[model samples]
Target: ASSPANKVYQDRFESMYSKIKDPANGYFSEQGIPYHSIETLMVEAPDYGHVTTSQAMSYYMWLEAMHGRFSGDFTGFDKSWSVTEQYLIPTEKDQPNTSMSRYDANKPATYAPEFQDPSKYPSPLDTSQPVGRDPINSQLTSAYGTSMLYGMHWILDVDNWYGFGARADGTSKPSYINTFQRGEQESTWETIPQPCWDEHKFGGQYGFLDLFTKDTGTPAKQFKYTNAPDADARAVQATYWADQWAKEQGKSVSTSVGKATKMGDYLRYSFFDKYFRKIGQPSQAGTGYDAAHYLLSWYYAWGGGIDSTWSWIIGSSHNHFGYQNPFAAWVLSTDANFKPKSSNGASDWAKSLDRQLEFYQWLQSAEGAIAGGATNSWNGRYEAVPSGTSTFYGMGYVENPVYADPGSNTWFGMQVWSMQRVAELYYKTGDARAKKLLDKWAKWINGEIKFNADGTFQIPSTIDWEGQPDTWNPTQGYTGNANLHVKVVNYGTDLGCASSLANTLTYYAAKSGDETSRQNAQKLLDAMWNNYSDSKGISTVEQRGDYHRFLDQEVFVPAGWTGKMPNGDVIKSGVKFIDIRSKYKQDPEWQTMVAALQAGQVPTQRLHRFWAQSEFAVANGVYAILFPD
Candidate 1:
């Protein structure tokens, strides 16, 4: 019983894994695709709980890969990747004739300035403005020997909950769909769900196209997909760990390595500026490396005609600090097994690693918490910032990286998710920059942790920022930014966030020999397991006060425009979010929620999100592996 394989940590992993894999738990679909969450009424990153995201898929792959590390069986890991490749990554058949083969790299895409108002769309495509030449499209196509992208689209309706159906055949389950198209200001409640391959089945005459883009001629029937860079990078990060773990066990993961390397090659698309323009300047065209931002942005999108032979691609200008993964960059840049195939791909990744580290330093607040990110395009219009806005490598510092309504950087989860990667990089390489960032972040995080006499704990839940970092000085950076600061506005027991936080502290403690961090990590893991463990997985009741918004949240459909959902819900101007999504009424908890809202009470539910469970399980194994005393 005291054997290495029978350690406490491994026991914890096995228990959590059993709950996750239990068919009675409703975690995976009939086809073995992971659901975003067990609850059908979830609304956060993804509007519908049944619709899986690339984020969840990456976490699923990672969870199985971690299992392989402990059990010496990689089949589950292989199966997870196989499902992702088949369903998430679009095939040539999904794009049809000449979608990528006919793409024009030089012109990239016509500029469509983003507005803060959802109703301000469909954003008029402004062709008169300067758009820079794409620098990597041809290189990637030549390297891969195909014009198609090798990346995963962000969201899929795993259970076909919306009934949009698949593009190839409208009857197929788990169709690709999109939301959050209006702009940074469009929250999930205000989003309109539309098909990726718009065949006029959902929205107005042109489907959802007319809602997002307005072209000189009519918007074409086309296949469009958006890559959430953070998710793609996380997959590569998971692969890097999997490969290393397999090597330690003297096993082979070459197939997954090859697949991950290919994805990293295309992930560079996220490194470029939206219009291929110079970083700090609005109108100047960038040549060669100047066009690349060298950090993971919010998204990279590609689209092409369905009946015609025209296609285009565009990168995003906004870079959120939470989206950076130096560990993945390190692997793509230096690890031979994970090197990209294109000419400058590996070098670009190496450069990205350096740039990303510098970005963290630039955004680190006086209080040690990393602040919101920067943007290459100001206001998505290339507008000039006020005289004193902080700059990072010529990019403008933003208080709220991408979204506006609820400041994207407000959530404390971003801190743990991102700093965990930084901690990993430091643990592996002892890079001075990584260590510096993590040392401060670890201290700040530790200071925020609170333990109770009743075996409960709380960590930072929401954060508030003040001021900005002093203008960056490349060679001799400031000792500290006394002005840029953060304050913990509140604290709560969010199990997923806590699990990742534990992992971050564990890794930092493993390398730095920080006894305080080590004890705290172990304490957090045990507290979560003892308090939150349930029949499904670790979960705490979350009060969804925002659900009341469904009744009054206006989804801005253009006036005079009308359409119908696949289930016959009418879509028209001035319609509330609930009006267009009558299916919510059919949810088992819907009536209770409605009654709660009617009674001025908040609705609460104990939910098991796939990513959170995976994080919690992985944290246990990680602590065991690093501190097997």
Candidate 2:
């Protein structure tokens, strides 16, 4: 009565648990965990200081809920939700700026806090501001704010403190400190303002919001709003105001969205708009960093708006921006920042290596996490988060000192994860040449730079896209060290950060056979899995699970999917027991690994479970034949 298929499935599932489960101590075996302890996975637990706690919590809660709903494990849901709520809504004392920020009260009006002094707010000319002008701020603010507004609307709008409050002026209040600082005070937090469908002068013909509602003839209907001028125009106007303000301050107006004065010129020169929308003419000369900014913003709007775009950005050729390219340093060496300092034009390999090492060193430093010129106890003026800007990708120019803004760039997380991935690849193939590159990056993230203080990290107030101060959390945490018995203020954990750490640890552990690294990887994996799972049971690709949007599948589908063998032979669907067997002989070693996986010849597991059956019977048969033993 027992079928071979049933036995195979049971065996594989058990094998997956064996890798992750600890028989002795319980708690999923610390040895099976990755990155850090699940309890201390984030720098801070229980309270999310300046970070977007709700977002992080949503991920965690989703994962917990998934385990409960799917695997019948409800033990961790309460703890996960409790931690998620801490960041979602902190007490008044833990607020970003004393009375001005409090998400604990569920009332809509509680969201708005009057700025006693506009001078304390964020603006292009506000030199005293803590979270100053930076693109990373722009991208992160947009992503967090929008996600709260739309994706987690039910939780945020409910008795829960995560939703935006209604202002006396009828506009939604800032859910976090950055929005209050920029919108309530400086009036510059309108990156994705009301009437989120209006068309503006910047971003070529279509406004940034156009990406959200491409099919609807009416922008308002497409954006599900009844506001005037639509989302596109509102975003454009916001950009215009920022640019004009910058110009009045005698600052160069080179934002990602509004670089061109005329619509025609914008349409002609905006490489991002051209490729992302696939509507406008391609720019003859791409504006490197600017293009990168546009791309980040576009992805924030599109990916966060609808999950469909995540795969597109990760997979499609259009996602290829020179500076954002994973292989940019190798492919465009002359144009990239990998070249050595040469007064006489000599390419010094040592200098190049040193530069990479130094860059990584800086990344790991406490200074790296703080804005360049921050002075307040917890607040910083520089945009410290990673943005798709810098000389590392050869996009920085002396003329453009503010080459990248950390807050507005979506690729901040992507860059970190990608660097780790490359490092793993290099390690697996024994590419000693890549040791310096890997060490530099790892040191910056794991050794030098601190992502948490008191186990918590604060989210920046304003993003570079907004070009204003994030005054909501005026006194938010920025230092590399600060611990509180309760949740810290103005800092929470980041889902992306967790994912990056987890994946990085996984890559390194697999490559070097480091048990410590493997444990850390498991910890991170558990944290990510426990967080960010939606109630509907959808998992974002950012987390390591069987989802449609994972970076691996989008980057190279063959890496995980099964396919037919070149000799027209069938391969059985299961795990590859032997090394050196390719699903398709035509594929390279890496490609073969991917192809075999896709063809179902490779046994598929999740965190360590056989969740799905392979569709490629032919590939599975071949895999079985090659690894008969």
Candidate 3:
């Protein structure tokens, strides 16, 4: 019965000690871990553009913030500044007389400069630039802004601005002549007001929520039910929630399942399809054929519902599963005449047959003790699977290749999950070759990919899926490390799952008499359990102070504001936002973060009850099919 504080401290100290003495050169030195030096480890080659880089940078920043090493002035240090500067800089002399406005040479002017005041930039929206305005520039600006805000919230106890107003320092103002001027030219400004107020009052206005809502095709009329369970029993309840949401918006749910399905399909096939390719490989031409095909296949394989419809809008296949399941999709085929109504589509049924044959071939490859792909050889260079525009399934292409620097094109956690899925698929079908592939993958994950000697994974310092890292500096943006962001619950949970998957595979390999695999698997499992668990059962990998706010005010508060006896009188004071903020003022970003969570906007990645059930089904199926035990 160890105290929670003692447990946390002991775990932290052990991890720190291990990192200091890492034998594989995992740490920067015996005295200290490399908190900021980029040279400590090989930086993965950039792929999937700035998104990947930004996510890595954000993770690093979060790590720093969690360890209390963030600064307020440093900004834009996480982005590919070297690349941006080299490519965007003009080749003219220092003081070119030409009236071309010196657009290229004016790097800092073109980019959002770091703000100098904290109170002046109170809102998250105030610091961020619009998306796609200048791809690289915007990413760097966002990385800086998010990091700064995250740091300020964590260390300085400031609440994020809630309305469509410029920062008091004028750093977040729209490009116009506003009274809150803080230097710099105000030209080329457009009237893109902040959506903060709109989001707070109307809901679903922020980028993270808005993107998922749009992708899911949850109509405004049915938006309230977006968080509802996708089971048949939950249908009526779901509809009720949808009706309530629509009423709030003065709208009604469209009764046309066909229309809803079409919109959903279009979102996946057209909107997301376009977005994925554009973001994953910006300069690539044409549709990403392979990526599109895999996505279409997955949609058809998983999406199931009587009311669902599918289509190939914008020339790519898509699916919609109505309200049946958020995980489900309505798949449309490339061939109009090939619309098979069976659980497995006509083409998919055929592909299943092909897969069976492929599995057999894979088994043949797996028979030998010295399998071709089994050994951990780094001789062959891994090439990024092409993300052809409009025609490829980005997720699938990246999942297959083993040697690729997963962090280069996508978040490392995502890569790990994808690989685990591949391994699971192979094991499910008893594909011996797939096992070899899995072994290779597991080896890399458990071996070469260094973990923090303390069982923690070192994430990059930049923008992540959850926005900016908590370590981001406010004044200097990415330039400082004081305002770093870290959310252990989200990133840590994913990492835990990957570790679990690796452990499970290693266990299988050990039973099969592979000593190396068995040892690796044991190490991974030990690391997962040691680093991720807490007295509360399984502690979230990263914990945001804001989550506490959400639990207290939105979740736990409504039941009873005070922790008191049921004598019809209050025994304790009601929890207030200010009180919670004050309690965690050392990490105020948690306030804004928790506010979003309470608003049902932030989507964490832990396996919920339903998700766990789904995983059980998948896991049991794989076990029964592969091992027959």
Candidate 4:
């Protein structure tokens, strides 16, 4: 019988791969907001249509690993990378035929989204100081697409030279990389643009082909923010503050832009200004650009810059994130063959893992208390503080002040991978601290899981410092009023990310030997049985809610429960998004739901994938692995 169940699981995963890979568009639609837009992304990719690389990168990499591990197919992963390869511009030609910034505001407006664009969106890297390269306008992070290239170099053993190309010419460079040019040093010899990142570039990973001055080319140090007003080739006078403290003990005392002169200037002027451009941007984050940035800087000490420490200022934003850092740990734990390119700054990775686990240790109290500036949606929880000193979703106001809630926090449930993988990685490594973190969250999560007699299952929507929940049986019994503009941070968990919880708990059971956890793992796996479609695993409800919410900030409990946005005066609903990820025409759902809407669905909806794409995908992968049949 050669594992019939394994074949079924593989089929389902393959179907999912169809949805995830897109060949024509040269991009992946991580998740189109408003569900309907996902259809558009698959079929109608306007030359301008594209999803941000942050979450897109997550899904792409996962697809890469999974496809390699399970299906032994590169066709799917190749299409996935094809889309991402669109953004790696090192020269003027590398810019997409039309830069996202160049697109008329009306295109996105015509599409009608939560209204995200250059107007509404800001760079993840603070670009207060321009790197003399058109204000450093990728608005992505160092790890955005770089890590995939690094993985390709080592994980797949692909011999490559000129990194992923920015233009069709096929050459791109890593962000925050350049020569250590001094005012007086202009020699005849040319040096490769060196990447400032330690781990991805030098600590052990492969960087772009021209990363350093070879054959005795000149040595150039990275430009740091602190270099300006001190060193003087051209001064940008940085205005932005990047990476708030959370360094080990007293390490926070050092200045941010001290070493690596060339890198510093670029960091302050172009990088900092761009990423922190928006209100919600913060120093501490477990996902998105910050997760990549801070994590990459892990361990490599290049003076006062972001090395060997972490920004305690964060919560894992519910994205199953902390990518480069935690993803490495999870992969390493899964297979020692998946070791990092280097362990130079690696102990730092461990330190950060422990520190972050400690934060969750305190946060997810005896009650279900994972805290951060989580957006309200399928897998979210919120603190209803009503009013007080600025408390933005429990992580603080640097994340931006909210107008609706008086509470201090909101929780995104998609972090099942982020939460469990940390503990699992630690356990695999034989660390007792992993148990402490697990015990704390387990105290909270166990109280929330329930096995309804009807065979429906649910996890807690929100639990406080003590084991009490606002909504247990999350989706099965979930209900909210019509036209009720529930704050984006206050969404209910529809699927409860059942697969993630179940798969994570499976590991937790093996590692902890906790009967209760083991039992709950069974229940959650059943949760998968209850929700997944027959052909392939799928999120029946909220999983479909990709860009379903308004800017991913507000939730709407419509009367019918199946249509339209909350339509807040400023944050109106009815906006849809496009996927640009139609690389999968064969998938039934893709054809039935996504392509059907290709010609007609609604007028002018926006096209964008939300950040939680990878969160859902990876955890689902875990589920498939744990219970194939």
Candidate number achieving the greatest TM-score relative to the actual structure: 1
Off by over 4 Å in 2: 1-192, 195-434, 440-496, 526-629
**lDDT for each of the candidates?**
0.88, 0.25, 0.25, 0.30
Worst 10 residues of 3 by lDDT: 148-157
User: Candidate 4: which stretches are off by over 4 Å?
Assistant: 1-37, 41-53, 72-351, 373-409, 462-493, 534-629
Task: Give the Cα-based TM-score of candidate 3 against the true structure.
Answer: 0.30
Comparing candidate 1 with candidate 4, which one achieves the higher lDDT? 1
TM-score of model 4 (CA atoms): 0.43
- Which candidate has the highest lDDT of all? 1
Model 4 RMSD in Å is: 18.3
- Name the lDDT value of residue 394 in candidate 3: 26
231-269 per-residue lDDT for model 1 (tens digits): 999999998888878877888788988888999999999
Candidate 2 lDDT (Cα, 0 to 1): 0.25
Write the residue-wise lDDT of candidate 3 on 1-629 in tens digits: 11122233234333432332244523222222121121211112210011112112222222221222111111212121222122111112211213122122111111122122211221122112211111121222233321000000000001111222221222332111101111111111101112211112222222112311123243221100001111211222122223333334444443412222222222222112221223233323223322232222111100111122211112111211111121122122222322333232334324332332222222121111111111000111112433331111122111111222111223343333333334433433454545654554454344433467667653222212222112212233222112222222223334334443543454356334556655554454455447654322123423322333324441112222232211112222354333422323333244555566667764232211112211222222222222322
